[PDB]
Amino acid sequence: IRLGCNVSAPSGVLERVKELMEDYSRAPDAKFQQQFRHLLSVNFEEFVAETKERNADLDWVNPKLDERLQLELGQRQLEENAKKRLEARKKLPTMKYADDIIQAVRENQVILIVGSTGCGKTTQVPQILLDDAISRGCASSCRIICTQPRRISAIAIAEWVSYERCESLGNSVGYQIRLESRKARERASITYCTTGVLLQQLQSDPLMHNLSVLILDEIHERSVETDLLMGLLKVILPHRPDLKVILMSATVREQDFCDYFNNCPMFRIEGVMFPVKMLYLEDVLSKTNYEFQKRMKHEAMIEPYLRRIRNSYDSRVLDKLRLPESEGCEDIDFIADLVYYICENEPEGAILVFLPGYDKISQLYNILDKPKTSKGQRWRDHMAVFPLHSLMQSGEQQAVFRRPPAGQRKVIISTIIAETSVTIDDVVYVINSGRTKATNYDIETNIQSLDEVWVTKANTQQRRGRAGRVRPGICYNLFSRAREDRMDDIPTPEILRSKLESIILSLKLLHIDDPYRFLQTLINAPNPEAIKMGVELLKRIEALDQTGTLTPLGMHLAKLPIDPQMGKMILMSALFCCLDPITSAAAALSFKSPFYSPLGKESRVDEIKRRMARNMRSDHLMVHNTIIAYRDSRYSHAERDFCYKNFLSSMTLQQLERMKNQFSELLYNYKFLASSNCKDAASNKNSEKIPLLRAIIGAGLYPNMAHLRKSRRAIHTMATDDGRRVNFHPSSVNSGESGFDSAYFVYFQRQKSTDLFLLDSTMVFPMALIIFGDGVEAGVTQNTPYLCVAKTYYFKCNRETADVVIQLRSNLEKLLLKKALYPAPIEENGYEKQLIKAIELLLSLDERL
DNA sequence: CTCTCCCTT
Known part of the structure; x- marks a missing residue:
C-alpha cells in the first residue's frame, strides 16, 4: 500500500462544514413519487391493460374526413400534376407489386419486403399502403411510421415522398428526428423518423397504440436500435392483434428476418x-x-x-x-x-x-x-x-x-x-x-x-x-x-459490441424487468457476461438497488436521451448549479467533438485546442470554452470567420447547443430546474468555479481514473485505476503537457491502438473524487492516518477531516435519494442548499492560487 | 504523437 498527497482540511473550514451539515441536519407535492411507486407495483398483465386505456386515440375515426380524402384523392387523379407522377411512379419495380403487398398486409400481421437500391420500397410502400386506405374510405384510421437508421435519410426521403404527392412538407408526409420535426397531419399520414425516435416514444406508448402500420427500414444493417425494436415486437404484437408491420431489408442475410418472425411472407423486389x-x-x-x-x-x-x-x-x-x-x-x-x-x-x-x-x-x-x-x-x-x-x-x-x-x-x-x-x-x-x-x-x-x-x-x-x-x-x-x-x-451485429447499461435500464420503463430473459430472444443474443457487467454498473451508480430493481434516480436516467453516467452528471449540475458547463461536457461525449482535423493542419489544430482549453487541462471543459466562444461569434456576426480560424464545424456546434437546450428542458420538466434555459443565471451561479466543474465531471465519469507519475512535449507514465499503462491520446489537449495541478484524471473512453490511449480527459482533485465516489474508508496504514477512494488511491489525511468528509458523504447520499423521489430545485436560501455550500467550500480549497 | 461509423417523445 502506497501513500499519496495530504487532503486534510484547515480547522476554520472543517468548523464551518460542521456548521452547515448540521443546518441541513435540522430540516423537516410529488406526483413523481406516486408514478415511480406505481411502475414497480404493477405486474405485466396490468401494465398492458392500463396503457391500452391511456392511448385510446385511434379507436375514433372521422368519416367526414374519410369521405373528404377519398373524394380529394379520386379528384386530384384527373388533374394534370399527378398522372405523370402516377405514371412515372409505375416505372419503379415496387409498383408492379402494389396489389400483392396490400393483400399480404391484410392477410398477415408481419411481412418482409426484400429489395435492393432503387426498387422504391422506401418511397413507394408507404404511399401504396396509405392510398389503399384513403380509397377504401378508411383514411382517418391510417397512420404510418417508417423508421430509418440515419437522420439524413429520414429527412431526404420525407422531402422526396412529399414532392411526389404534390404537397409541402408537413401535410401527409412528415419527418421526425431528435430535436427537429416537420410533423405530418394527425391522421392519414406518413412520418419518417429515426429508429431512436420511436424507441423513446415507446415510454409513453409501449404497445404502439398510436400507429396503424410500422415499417422498419434497413433492418439488414443490424443497427442496435432495429434489433432491439424487432425483439420488442415479439413481446408487443401478441397484444396488438390489429397492428401491421412491414419489415424492409436489402438482400443481405434476408432469410434471418424471415426466420426470426415465424416463417412470415417474403417479397423480393428486383432492383434498378x-x-x-x-x-x-x-x-x-x-x-x-x-x-x-x-x-x-x-x-x-x-x-x-x-x-x-x-x-x-x-x-x-x-x-x-x-x-x-x-x-x-x-x-x-x-x-x-x-x-x-x-x-x-x-x-x-x-x-x-x-x-x-x-x-x-x-x-x-x-x-x-x-x-x-x-x-x-x-x-x-x-x-x-x-x-x-x-x-x-x-x-x-x-x-x-x-x-x-x-x-x-x-x-x-x-x-x-x-x-x-x-x-x-x-x-x-x-x-x-x-x-x-x-x-x-x-x-x-x-x-x-x-x-x-x-x-x-x-x-x-x-x-x-x-x-x-x-x-x-x-x-x-x-x-x-x-x-x-x-x-x-x-x-458483427451492432448489439454484440455495445455497452448494455443504457438498454438494460430503458427496458425497465417498458416493464421488461429481467434483461437476461428478453435480450436473449433477439436475432443475436448478446454475451450474458456483458449484461451482468452492465447491470453491475447500474448498481454501482445507484440507478438499480442490490436486488436489481429500478431506483428513483434510475427511473430518471432511463427517461433521458443520454447514457446513464452522464445523465447523472447532468442531474448533479442541476443541484450544484453548474448546468451550462456540464451539459456541454455531457453532450460532447454523447455526440462528438466540434473540431475538424483537416489534412496537414494537425499540429495547428492541437494549438487551437490548447488555446481553447485555456490551460484548464480538461478536454470536456475545452469543448465548453469553444461553445462560449461560438455564442459570442454569433453575437459578433463573425460566425464563419470564427469557425474557419479554429477549424470548427458550425453544423456540429449547433447540434451540441440543441442537445444542451434539450437537457435543460427535460430537467425543467422533471422539476430539477427553475428555468428551461441552460444559460439561466440562477441555474449557473457556480458555473465559474473550476474545482466544482471538475467535481461533477468526476461524479459523472467515475470510476474511470488515471494516475500520472512522470516528467520531461514531455514523457508520461500514467496508469489507469486497474494498473494498465495508458497515455493521453494525441488529440487530447493533455498529450505532452507538463506541470499539472493534479496527477489524477477522469476519462470517458479508453482505447488501444498503437498504445493504450485515453481519448479525452479531465484533471480532478483528490478531495472531489472522495466526496462523490465510493469505496471511501479511513484508517492507518503504517503510522500514517489515511483516506482512500475505491480501495485503490489511499491519501494521507488527518482524523478531524476524515470524520467530517465521511459524515459529509452520508448527508450527500441522503439528499440525492430524497431529490430523486421528490423532485424540486434546491432552494437558494433553504436547508438543502446548506449542504451544497458545504461541498462548494471544501472543493474550493484546491483552487489555483 | 493519432483519429471506423450510426444515434436517442
Whole structure:
C-alpha cells in the first residue's frame, strides 16, 4: 500500500462544514413519487391493460374526413400534376407489386419486403399502403411510421415522398428526428423518423397504440436500435392483434428476418441500377501490370486458388497474387497506379477509393497531390482530389458532391463513411481496398481496441453499388477472389459490441424487468457476461438497488436521451448549479467533438485546442470554452470567420447547443430546474468555479481514473485505476503537457491502438473524487492516518477531516435519494442548499492560487 | 504523437 498527497482540511473550514451539515441536519407535492411507486407495483398483465386505456386515440375515426380524402384523392387523379407522377411512379419495380403487398398486409400481421437500391420500397410502400386506405374510405384510421437508421435519410426521403404527392412538407408526409420535426397531419399520414425516435416514444406508448402500420427500414444493417425494436415486437404484437408491420431489408442475410418472425411472407423486389462490373486482384494486375517492391497463413489461402485459374491469367499475374502485400492497401503506390490507369483509359466519371483510416487516406493524398513518379506529375493537375472523413470538413461543403471543372476528374479518398451515410452521385469507378478499421471489445481484459480488418461480403456488395448511380461503372477489388471466400457474411451485429447499461435500464420503463430473459430472444443474443457487467454498473451508480430493481434516480436516467453516467452528471449540475458547463461536457461525449482535423493542419489544430482549453487541462471543459466562444461569434456576426480560424464545424456546434437546450428542458420538466434555459443565471451561479466543474465531471465519469507519475512535449507514465499503462491520446489537449495541478484524471473512453490511449480527459482533485465516489474508508496504514477512494488511491489525511468528509458523504447520499423521489430545485436560501455550500467550500480549497 | 461509423417523445 502506497501513500499519496495530504487532503486534510484547515480547522476554520472543517468548523464551518460542521456548521452547515448540521443546518441541513435540522430540516423537516410529488406526483413523481406516486408514478415511480406505481411502475414497480404493477405486474405485466396490468401494465398492458392500463396503457391500452391511456392511448385510446385511434379507436375514433372521422368519416367526414374519410369521405373528404377519398373524394380529394379520386379528384386530384384527373388533374394534370399527378398522372405523370402516377405514371412515372409505375416505372419503379415496387409498383408492379402494389396489389400483392396490400393483400399480404391484410392477410398477415408481419411481412418482409426484400429489395435492393432503387426498387422504391422506401418511397413507394408507404404511399401504396396509405392510398389503399384513403380509397377504401378508411383514411382517418391510417397512420404510418417508417423508421430509418440515419437522420439524413429520414429527412431526404420525407422531402422526396412529399414532392411526389404534390404537397409541402408537413401535410401527409412528415419527418421526425431528435430535436427537429416537420410533423405530418394527425391522421392519414406518413412520418419518417429515426429508429431512436420511436424507441423513446415507446415510454409513453409501449404497445404502439398510436400507429396503424410500422415499417422498419434497413433492418439488414443490424443497427442496435432495429434489433432491439424487432425483439420488442415479439413481446408487443401478441397484444396488438390489429397492428401491421412491414419489415424492409436489402438482400443481405434476408432469410434471418424471415426466420426470426415465424416463417412470415417474403417479397423480393428486383432492383434498378446501372450494372457495375466486378474486378478482383487478378483482374487488376492483368490490366495495369503493376510491379511490387520498396505470416503465411497467406500462402495457405492463395495457393489453392492459383491452381483452379492457372490458365485464365498470365503466370506473372498469378505470381504477383502470392505476395502478402498485393491485397488490401499495403502498397499505396499500387492504388495510385490504378487511379492513374483509370484516368488514362476509361470514360469520364469520378473515382471512389475506399481506404481503412486517416493515416492511409493521408498517404494516398500526398502521393496524388505531390507525386514523385513521372506518371503522377503528369496527372496531378488533372485530378480534383477530396479526402472524405468524418473528422474532415469535406463532407460539410458542396464541393465533393458537385462535378469537377472541365478537363479534371474527381477523385475521392474515403473511409467507410461514403458506403452509406454520404452519397456521391457522379462516381462511376470504385476502388475497394477491402480493409477498414473496427472497434473490438475484449470482455476479459476490458480493453476496447480499434484494429484494421478485412471488410465483409456485405461491405463489398454495398461499395459496388456506389458506382452504379449514374452510368455503368466499375468496382475494382484489391483482394483476390480467394480472399472474399474467407470474408464474413456481414459485420458483427451492432448489439454484440455495445455497452448494455443504457438498454438494460430503458427496458425497465417498458416493464421488461429481467434483461437476461428478453435480450436473449433477439436475432443475436448478446454475451450474458456483458449484461451482468452492465447491470453491475447500474448498481454501482445507484440507478438499480442490490436486488436489481429500478431506483428513483434510475427511473430518471432511463427517461433521458443520454447514457446513464452522464445523465447523472447532468442531474448533479442541476443541484450544484453548474448546468451550462456540464451539459456541454455531457453532450460532447454523447455526440462528438466540434473540431475538424483537416489534412496537414494537425499540429495547428492541437494549438487551437490548447488555446481553447485555456490551460484548464480538461478536454470536456475545452469543448465548453469553444461553445462560449461560438455564442459570442454569433453575437459578433463573425460566425464563419470564427469557425474557419479554429477549424470548427458550425453544423456540429449547433447540434451540441440543441442537445444542451434539450437537457435543460427535460430537467425543467422533471422539476430539477427553475428555468428551461441552460444559460439561466440562477441555474449557473457556480458555473465559474473550476474545482466544482471538475467535481461533477468526476461524479459523472467515475470510476474511470488515471494516475500520472512522470516528467520531461514531455514523457508520461500514467496508469489507469486497474494498473494498465495508458497515455493521453494525441488529440487530447493533455498529450505532452507538463506541470499539472493534479496527477489524477477522469476519462470517458479508453482505447488501444498503437498504445493504450485515453481519448479525452479531465484533471480532478483528490478531495472531489472522495466526496462523490465510493469505496471511501479511513484508517492507518503504517503510522500514517489515511483516506482512500475505491480501495485503490489511499491519501494521507488527518482524523478531524476524515470524520467530517465521511459524515459529509452520508448527508450527500441522503439528499440525492430524497431529490430523486421528490423532485424540486434546491432552494437558494433553504436547508438543502446548506449542504451544497458545504461541498462548494471544501472543493474550493484546491483552487489555483 | 493519432483519429471506423450510426444515434436517442
